[PDB]
Each structure stands twice: as structure tokens, then as C-alpha cells.
């Protein structure tokens, strides 16, 4: 079953968002460099 409803703890919304942006940034550079290596050599 899913967790009951809520309507408090505004600090939870912030942490969630921070993770979303931080995740996209890391995955963005990681995934990009992960695929690039397959294309061609960029690091000399």
C-alpha cells in the first residue's frame, strides 16, 4: 500500500527538487561522456 496523505514539512519539497536538478546534472555529464567515448576520442 501507498503512504498516507500529508500537508506539512516544507523542507521535504526542497530536498526533492535539489536532488532532481543535481541528478540531471550528474547524469547529463556522465551519460554524455559515456556515449561520446563510443563516437570518437576527444581526450587527445
Amino acid at each position: 500500500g501507498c503512504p498516507a496523505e500529508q500537508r506539512a514539512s516544507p523542507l521535504t519539497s526542497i530536498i526533492s527538487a535539489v536532488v532532481g536538478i543535481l541528478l540531471v546534472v550528474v547524469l547529463g555529464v556522465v551519460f554524455g561522456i559515456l556515449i561520446k567515448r563510443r563516437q570518437q576520442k576527444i581526450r587527445k
Partner: protein, 44 residues
């Protein structure tokens, strides 16, 4: 006066993780659909 009605009891902080995941999926869907709306595909 009294009757705190509890507070720190799951669910509570767990919302943080769910928020990060949900947002990630929500954003990915919005960015992917908007970027695809212009028939801009990386590979077919």
C-alpha cells in the same frame, strides 16, 4: 496547551525520495516531449 497530534512518524521524510524520483520523471517527460515536438530525434 497539549495534544501535539504526533509529528515525526513515517510517512514523513520518505516523501523526499519520492519527490526527487517523481519530479525526474515529470521533467524528463516534459523536456522529451517538447524536444521531440520539433521532430528533433537523435537517432531513428
Amino acid at each position: 496547551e497539549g495534544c501535539p497530534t504526533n509529528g515525526p512518524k513515517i510517512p514523513s521524510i520518505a516523501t523526499g525520495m519520492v519527490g526527487a524520483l517523481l519530479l525526474l520523471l515529470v521533467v524528463a517527460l516534459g523536456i522529451g516531449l517538447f524536444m521531440r515536438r520539433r521532430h528533433i530525434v537523435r537517432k531513428r
